[PDB]
Amino acid sequence: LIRRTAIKVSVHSWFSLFITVTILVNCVCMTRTDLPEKIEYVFTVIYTFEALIKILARGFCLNEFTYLRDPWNWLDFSVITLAYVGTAIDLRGISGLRTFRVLRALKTVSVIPGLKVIVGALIHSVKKLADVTILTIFCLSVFALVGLQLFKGNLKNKCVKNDMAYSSHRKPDIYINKRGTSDPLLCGNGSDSGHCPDGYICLKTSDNPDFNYTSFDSFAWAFLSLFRLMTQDSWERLYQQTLRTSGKIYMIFFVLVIFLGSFYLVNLILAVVTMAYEEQNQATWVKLKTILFGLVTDPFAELTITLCIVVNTIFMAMEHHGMSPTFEAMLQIGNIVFTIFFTAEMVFKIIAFDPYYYFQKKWNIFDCIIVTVSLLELGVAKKGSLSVLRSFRLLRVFKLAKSWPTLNTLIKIIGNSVGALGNLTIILAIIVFVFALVGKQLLGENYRNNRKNISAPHEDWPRWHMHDFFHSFLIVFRILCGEWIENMWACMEVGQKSICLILFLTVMVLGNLVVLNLFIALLLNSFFADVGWQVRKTCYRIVEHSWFESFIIFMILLSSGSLAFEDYYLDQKPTVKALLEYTDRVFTFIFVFEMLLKWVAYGFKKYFTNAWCWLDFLIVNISLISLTAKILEYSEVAPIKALRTLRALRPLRALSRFEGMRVVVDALVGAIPSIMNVLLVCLIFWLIFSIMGVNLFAGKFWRCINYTDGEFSLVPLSIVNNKSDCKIQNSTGSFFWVNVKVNFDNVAMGYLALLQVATFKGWMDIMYAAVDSREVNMQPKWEDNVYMYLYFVIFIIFGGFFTLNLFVGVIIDNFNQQKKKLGGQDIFMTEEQKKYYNAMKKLGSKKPQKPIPRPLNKFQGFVFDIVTRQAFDITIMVLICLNMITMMVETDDQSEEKTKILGKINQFFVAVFTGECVMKMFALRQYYFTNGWNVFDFIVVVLSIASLIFSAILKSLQSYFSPTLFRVIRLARIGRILRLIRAAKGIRTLLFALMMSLPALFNIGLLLFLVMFIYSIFGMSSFPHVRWEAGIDDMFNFQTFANSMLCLFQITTSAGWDGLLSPILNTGPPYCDPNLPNSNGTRGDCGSPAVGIIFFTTYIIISFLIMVNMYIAVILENFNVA
């Protein structure tokens, strides 16, 4: 009973609070290495004493064996043991010593009241991801085998110099580096692969591009590359390398892999989480006279406040780098006036509403803190003193929340991540801290002793390392943003490869899982808790006839297609120009005749009140205005040329003709109104973050570079430190005071900078400029302001993660309301596509297998008996698995003997499968073909026999066509692997869901293709002379239709859109030459920053909208199937 009395006063939320404080202080202490001498010991001694209290505490609570029953108590026991060991003769400097200690940070779960239940939900969510994980592994293995077959040994191709006049290789293979980087150039010997400069031949080398880690030469390397593609981490770089070493047509491959693997799977995972989280939740005297007037705070007074806030915001949003002294003084005067006005409010209110009651409110204390900080800066007014708190006023914009229902929704989602859903945030913080400390402890010293290998050519250290806690946390955060493989390559070259693999993969997977469970949890909990009349009749007859509609559709298709031949090289084709010219004239005449027919049949009112006959009228007008200009002598006048660039809108006349595009456009139009309001809410938040960024980084991104021949180098600080020294040292006419293209020089360009940091493309350069910043007219210095990274870490958490949770919630609510209004009708689907969907519904549910009769003849019956059993199917399935393992061991440059043995094994396998097909056809006569999987096997067997015979015919025996054709012929063995889908019920259900969702995906992809075609035509007209820099290169440019479509497909996933915006943002020397010897567009290789920022930003927004609509379609299909 004594132990019971001790436990009464030894265990309670006080005891737990003390344990929490002790473990937290232990964590924060173990963050710092070289923790003070003589206390490195004293603290672990204190924390050792923590442990005796915890053991004696059990003794007063549980029993030696009952205590252990709980899984969490063993961790505590491990903690008590290690401690005692280290007191005497335990290795002092082994990596393991504190990695065992860092679990002690994970001990918070057992002491924080409600984390354990949340963790169990996480294991449940993991347990529901089984079938999707199996499908993902199968798909990645299949695509890795395909990639191995097609692209093995290609990324080892490099431009090697020729010889002048022979033992082995004549001197090291002198390569050439592609302009702007130090990486060696990759090429190919194909027609659409890539060409070397003069005096350079394509040769296969021994090394892979990045760090000998980017390859398709083995199943492991191909699997890693396909996992990278599925995660879409720098997938555009691999895309470009593969198309440069193999050919442009192979882009088709990638296309199929960024849709199946990278898109369809991301959506199963989402659904599998969503459904599961839902399952878990659906489971659960004169003072009095002043008071008379002080409480005169009527309706007008609150309006005055809102107007003052708005005017303060619009004055703070007009500061820039080039502010004049009078304008600068105007802003300071306005800020002082507003500050004294807000001080006046609070002093008037508080002395009206007694202080006690005034503080009792929650907006009032917010007002108080804002105004106190404002006055604090008003007192200590230095030029640059706490610029972040100079922007602190901006939070007054949240005052508008009380009347703006969507801002209140953002503020509730923000507050829910620390309230009802605080446990997920706590676990995320613990995971980030634990992996950061583990990475620092295991791979800290290697990063410092081997830095030369992973550092930039002119730098003396890597930009992302693990020597200290801050940089390890930055690496973990960047992994949580989807960028992991480059730092993984960097760490494999500096430390242990196995540790890198395990650490990076575990961090990525287990952090993305918790980030999704918080995103979905926030979404759910927040949001969802006379003769003229006769001829008119005749014309009416003419218009609604089917042949006329077909003719008009064919004319529109031809008009759209003819635009794809007006490219950079049309001036070199003399006859094509005239042919296209006459074709355009006749098409314009035809469409004018159509418009007159619709004006004489439909009637003017009907015509001008249909919104699909206005978009046709407008296009006909544009064309007529152009044609009249061309027949006259005003074709080169600048307004008219701009009107002519509007000929890329001609493909928009196909929307009204085809019904699927029409219905999907109607669905988008029905969603636009709410998208507008959420967009306004986001703009006001990102203005608070853009005004903050302008306060921090205005005019501080200017550098001096040494530009010689297409490569620039930052001038070292030992020679140049100021803009003034930069001019005096420009002796060779080769130093230039340049600026970062995407800077924070004003609020307008700050919006572009935050778009690159939110989409995570181009954010890296913006951050590096910010973290090297110094005062204006001073050369940037390496990480002078390292703690500026945090600023970008707070934008991504609040600006991006929480303003996408708002957008997705609003979209889901709108979609649900629209469905319900359409009586829960399948949107994105045409009427006959609904019949197709009903037929697909009926197929999947018919269980009857109607076994087939037994053949009368004895031998046929015997074959029937030996075929129908389940042992036959199991044996064939394990044979297919053996064949898959046999194809997994193919490696580039292996041996002749291995190739011969593998070929003989393939011959044996195809013979075995042909014998089973013959036996099945001899046992099952017509019934065999009645089934749909037997036809598939039959097709696979025929394709394999055809592959063998055609390879045998087309080998040395006959015409030796390009060897790469053989590589395509042996792609017929993957069907044997695809025959394994027959047994896997989960895979066969997920693929059925995909088949069910295909019909609407077709229409949405039709809109995506139309959008890509229109933008290609604009880009091809506007950006075809820009100098090759960054993304734009001799293969991915805007000089032809295929080159433009490659870039637009690449940036459809927003990948590398900053790399294509970079060359268009050039407006002069040293990057662009104005008055270039021979270019007619702007006389030069410069770009159009304004047209470029509208093109690349509008495209990504529209693409995101289309993708999220596809996401909704696929997720609802998955829910319906399950």
Ligand X SMILES: CCCCCCCC/C=C\CCCCCCCC(=O)OC[C@H](COP(=O)(O)OCC[N+](C)(C)C)OC(=O)CCCCCCC/C=C\CCCCCCCC
Ligand Y SMILES: CCCCCCCCCCCCCCCCCCOC[C@@H](O)COP(=O)(O)OCC[N+](C)(C)C
Ligand Z SMILES: COc1cc(NC(=O)c2ccc(-c3ccc(Cl)cc3)o2)cc(OC)c1
Ligand U SMILES: CCCCCCCCCCCCCCCCCC(=O)OC[C@H](COP(=O)(O)OC[C@H](N)C(=O)O)OC(=O)CCCCCCCCCCCCCCCCC
Ligand V SMILES: *[C@@H]1O[C@H](CO)[C@@H](O[C@@H]2O[C@H](CO)[C@@H](O)[C@H](O)[C@H]2NC(C)=O)[C@H](O)[C@H]1NC(C)=O
CB of 279 to ligand CLR, least distance (A): 11
Could you tell me the two tokens for 502?
């395990």
Could you tell me the two tokens for 610?
């249909």
785 contacts which partner out of ligand U, ligand Z, ligand CLR, none, CB within 5 to 8 A by kind?
Answer: none
- Binding flags for ligand V, 1063-1082, as an x/- string (CB under 6 A): ------x-------------
Q: Which residue is nearest to ligand U, using beta carbons?
A: 505
Neighbours of 1046 (CB within 10 A): 22
Residue 682 sits in the site that holds ligand U (CB under 6 A): yes
- Binding flags for ligand Y, 13-42, as an x/- string (CB under 6 A): ------------------------------
- Binding flags for ligand Y, 827-856, as an x/- string (CB under 6 A): ------x--x--------------------
Residue closest to 231 by CA, chosen among 486, 439, 440: 486
User: In the range 186-225, which residues lie near ligand CLR by CB under 6 A?
Assistant: 218-220
| Pairing relationship of beta strands 735-739 and 712-714 according to DSSP bridges | unpaired
Q: Which residue has the tokens 């309230």?
A: 419
Q: Residues 49, 72, 582, 614: which binds ligand CLR (CB under 6 A)? A: 614
Residue 227 sits in the site that holds ligand U (CB under 6 A): yes
* Spatial distance between the Cα atoms of 641 and 647, rounded to a whole number of angstroms: 10
* CB-nearer residue toward ligand V: 720 or 1100: 720
Residue 257 sits in the site that holds ligand CLR (CB under 6 A): no
* CB-nearer residue toward ligand NAG: 201 or 949: 201
* Spatial distance between the Cα atoms of 253 and 246, rounded to a whole number of angstroms: 11
Q: Residues 322, 932, 963, 1077: which binds ligand X (CB under 6 A)? A: 932
* Spatial distance between the Cα atoms of 282 and 827, rounded to a whole number of angstroms: 27
Question: Of how many residues is the chain composed?
Answer: 1122
Q: In degrees to the nearest 10, what's the CA dihedral of 504, 509, 510, 513?
A: 150
Stretch of residues binding ligand V (CB under 6 A), selected from 47-55, 732-740, 896-904, 1114-1122: 732-740
Look at phi and psi of residue 1054 and say left if phi exceeds 0, alpha if psi is from -120 to 50, else beta.
Answer: left
- 689, 799 in Cβ contact below 8 A? yes
Residue 722 sits in the site that holds ligand V (CB under 6 A): yes
Residue 738, classed as helix, strand or coil, is strand
- Binding flags for ligand U, 1036-1075, as an x/- string (CB under 6 A): -------------------------------x--------
Q: Residues 232, 656, 730, 989: which binds ligand Z (CB under 6 A)? A: 232
Q: Residues 591, 685, 735, 913: which binds ligand V (CB under 6 A)? A: 735
Burial class (CB in 10 A: 0-12, 13-18, 19+), 1083: middle
Residue 863 sits in the site that holds ligand Z (CB under 6 A): no
1100 contacts which partner out of ligand Z, ligand V, ligand NAG, none, CB within 5 to 8 A by kind?
Answer: ligand Z
Phi and psi angles of residue 969, each rounded to the nearest 5 degrees, phi first:
-70, -35
Residue 1001 sits in the site that holds ligand Y (CB under 6 A): yes
| Distance of alpha carbon 1054 from the chain centroid | 7
Residue 722, classed as helix, strand or coil, is strand
* Spatial distance between the Cα atoms of 554 and 551, rounded to a whole number of angstroms: 5
Residue 716 sits in the site that holds ligand V (CB under 6 A): no
Q: Residues 144, 159, 229, 258: which binds ligand Z (CB under 6 A)? A: 258
* Spatial distance between the Cα atoms of 270 and 250, rounded to a whole number of angstroms: 30
683 contacts which partner out of ligand Y, ligand U, ligand X, none, CB within 5 to 8 A by kind?
Answer: ligand U
* CB-nearer residue toward ligand X: 556 or 757: 757
- Binding flags for ligand U, 500-519, as an x/- string (CB under 6 A): -xx--xx--xx---------
724 contacts which partner out of ligand CLR, ligand NAG, ligand V, none, CB within 5 to 8 A by kind?
Answer: ligand V
Q: In degrees to the nearest 10, what's the CA dihedral of 133, 138, 144, 145?
A: 170
Residue 142 sits in the site that holds ligand X (CB under 6 A): yes
Burial class (CB in 10 A: 0-12, 13-18, 19+), 172: exposed
Stretch of residues binding ligand V (CB under 6 A), selected from 79-87, 359-367, 604-612, 724-732: 724-732
- Binding flags for ligand Z, 996-1035, as an x/- string (CB under 6 A): ------------x---------------------------
C-alpha distance across the termini of the chain, in Å: 56
| Distance of alpha carbon 33 from the chain centroid | 36
Computed on alpha carbons and rounded to an integer, the radius of gyration of the chain in Å comes to: 34
Q: Residues 138, 527, 737, 1041: which binds ligand V (CB under 6 A)? A: 737
Phi and psi angles of residue 1037, each rounded to the nearest 5 degrees, phi first:
-140, -165
H-assigned helices in 523-636: 531-543, 546-562, 574-601, 604-608, 614-631
Contacts of 324 (CB under 8 A, 6+ apart): none
Could you tell me the two tokens for 899?
């190739």
Q: Which residue is nearest to ligand Y, using beta carbons?
A: 564
Q: Residues 57, 368, 513, 995: which binds ligand X (CB under 6 A)? A: 995
Stretch of residues binding ligand X (CB under 6 A), selected from 116-124, 636-644, 739-747, 925-933: 925-933
502 contacts which partner out of ligand U, ligand CLR, ligand NAG, none, CB within 5 to 8 A by kind?
Answer: ligand U
Phi and psi angles of residue 190, each rounded to the nearest 5 degrees, phi first:
-85, 175
* Spatial distance between the Cα atoms of 62 and 76, rounded to a whole number of angstroms: 14
Q: Which residue has the tokens 């004006």?
A: 599
778 contacts which partner out of ligand X, ligand NAG, ligand Z, none, CB within 5 to 8 A by kind?
Answer: none
Q: Which residues bind ligand U (CB under 6 A)?
A: 220, 223-224, 227, 497-498, 501-502, 505-506, 509-510, 679, 682-683, 686, 745, 748-749, 751-752, 755, 1067, 1089-1090, 1093-1094, 1097-1098, 1101
Q: Which residues bind ligand Y (CB under 6 A)?
A: 146, 190, 249-250, 252-253, 256, 259, 414, 417-418, 425, 477, 480-481, 515, 557, 560-561, 564-565, 610-612, 615, 651, 654, 665, 669, 796-797, 800-801, 804, 833, 836, 962, 964-965, 968, 998-999, 1001-1002, 1005, 1008-1010, 1013, 1040-1041
